[PDB]
Amino acid sequence: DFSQHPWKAPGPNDLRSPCPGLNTLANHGFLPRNGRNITIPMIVQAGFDGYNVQPDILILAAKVGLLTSPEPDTFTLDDLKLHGTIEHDASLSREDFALGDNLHFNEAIFNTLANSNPGSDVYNITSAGQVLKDRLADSLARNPNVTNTGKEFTIRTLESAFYLSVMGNATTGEAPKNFVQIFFREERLPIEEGWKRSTTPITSDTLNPIAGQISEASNWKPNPDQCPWIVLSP
Amino acid sequence: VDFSQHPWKAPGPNDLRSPCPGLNTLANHGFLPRNGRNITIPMIVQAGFDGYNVQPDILILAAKVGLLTSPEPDTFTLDDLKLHGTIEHDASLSREDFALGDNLHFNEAIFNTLANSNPGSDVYNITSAGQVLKDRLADSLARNPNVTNTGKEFTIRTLESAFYLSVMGNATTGEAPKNFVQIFFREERLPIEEGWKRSTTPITSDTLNPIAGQISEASNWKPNPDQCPWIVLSP
Ligand code: HEM
Ligand code: HEM
Ligand SMILES: [Mg+2]
Ligand SMILES: [Mg+2]
């Protein structure tokens, strides 16, 4: 029932993340609107309620997210900005940590995703891959501190599988462009615009094939002498 | 803390245990569930404080990484913690390498090195701890073609050695009566009847790290050249 879950703009003391997925859930009150005191069970519930995303992938992501917080079993959405845990260079809608603000939505960065799949009414696996190339190529040219290993790349293919899957079709990875634009720009569920919570459950068995196809369409190579790492503590 | 309400009891076949004498001992006295199940990060902080006077910072971090070994949302079992390459590492003090046998259970043959350390002394110390780290790594290098030896394992090994010296011994000097350390590993018991008292000084990152750092210097250690440190993220 989305009627109990109206969108509201985050106010002054309301903490947000670099993740449109969680920010959208907070802005609809599926997570605390203040973005504080989030447990792994609250993530599993908000993800299932909002998007029909199943626990498997949410538990893993939330456990890694926890490492960004000094708290025993909670994090704030602001904690999740910690560079090198999940937050990575070559984001779709955020600047690289080394160049500026790795937290907030940035229209200038988002422009690439916005303008992708020209002449189509959807983003798809092909356009998602092209955006991954363009964003990485940007960070490699302007960021001498770029981190581009297997870890960041896997997360990038998964995050791109996420926007295609939760705003669009979880099997084909096609998503109406206006749904994806609203998701990123307003961190809002485009309910009035016709968006429905996925009827098909979003699992690692649906996300992985989509992430894999985005990967193939990205024509990716790692930086040669970089070791994959999860920063373990703030 | 009242240890009278926390009696040692031999773990049964019902009861899940880890490769960690620290947690296993806490479970054996009922500071953690004796069945070794349904352990939250808050239960770890409390059991660590109650049993050993260990402060939350280092326990929170260790427990959050331990969680990665579990498919459950916010709990692990002690048996989950055996997952090779999360925390569990080659060149353990009392367990065999995953590649060569059992990386879970106490092994007397492996423990022999630590047991015979600091010969002609009644205590184990930073010097003997360092020598045991060299000897155990050298053993794994000789016998384990698949040995993983990077900054991550080494840091964890210096910390785990700082832990046995600190919780069974003196948290400032890193000296520990040998029979305390030997019961801790062999029986996963607080040696209360044998005179062990919970540390009066709080065991923190600021007490552990200096000890781990000195153990490191006494270990004369080098990483394997072409290995990347990594935390295995899921079973
Ligand atoms: C619930 C479904 C989820 C969806 C649909 C989702 C979606 C996304 C998307 C599309 C991005 C890419 C943003 C960009 O590159 O500009 C992203 C980034 C991120 N997400 Fe999620 N997410 C979800 C769950 C989670 C969870 C559970 C966590 C952590 C607990 C998380 C943490 C992050 C972080 C830290 C980033 C920053 C990565 C970066 O761009 O550098 N997300 N998410
Ligand atoms: C609370 C005080 C703690 C103490 C005194 C302690 C002590 C130790 C010691 C001495 C070892 C080395 C055993 C050996 O090499 O044979 C060890 C190993 C281990 N501990 Fe802990 N520990 C503590 C807390 C924790 C916590 C909170 C976790 C995870 C939640 C944990 C997980 C492990 C694991 C997985 C190993 C296996 C490492 C290996 O030898 O391969 N311990 N612990
Ligand atoms: Mg980023
Ligand atoms: Mg081991």
Author numbering:
A (entry chain A): 6 to 239
B (entry chain C): 5 to 239
Sentences from the paper on this structure:
The structure of the artUPO expressed in E. coli was also determined to see if there were any significant differences that may result from a lack of in vivo glycosylation. artUPObact crystals were obtained in the P212121 space group and again featured two molecules in the asymmetric unit, forming a dimer that was again connected by a disulfide bridge between residues C232. The monomers superimposed with an rmsd of 0.26 A over 232 C alpha atoms, reflective of their very high structural similarity. Few obvious differences could be discerned between the structures of artUPOyeast and artUPObact, except that the N‐terminal residues D6, F7 and S8 could be modelled in the latter, but not the former, and there was of course no glycosylation on asparagine sites N42, N129, N150 and N174 in the bacterially expressed enzyme. The results clearly show that the onset of aggregation for artUPObact of approximately 59 °C is significantly lower than that for artUPOyeast. This lower stability may be a direct consequence of the lack of glycosylation and was indeed manifested in visible precipitation of artUPObact in biotransformation reactions (vide infra). Despite this difference in peroxidase activity, the catalytic efficiency of peroxygenase activity toward NBD of artUPOyeast and artUPObact was more or less equivalent.
Unspecific peroxygenases (UPOs) are a class of heme‐thiolate oxygenases from fungi that have similar catalytic scope to P450s, but are dependent only upon hydrogen peroxide (H2O2) as the external oxidant. A recent survey by Faiza and co‐workers explored the diversity of UPOs within sequence databases and was able to identify two major groups of enzymes: ‘long’ UPOs (Group I), typified by AaeUPO, of approximately 45 kDa molecular weight, and ‘short’ UPOs (Group II), typified by the enzyme from Marasmius rotula (MroUPO), which are of approximately 29 kDa. In this study, we have cloned the gene encoding an ‘artificial’ short UPO (artUPO) close in sequence to MroUPO, and expressed it in both Pichia pastoris and E. coli.
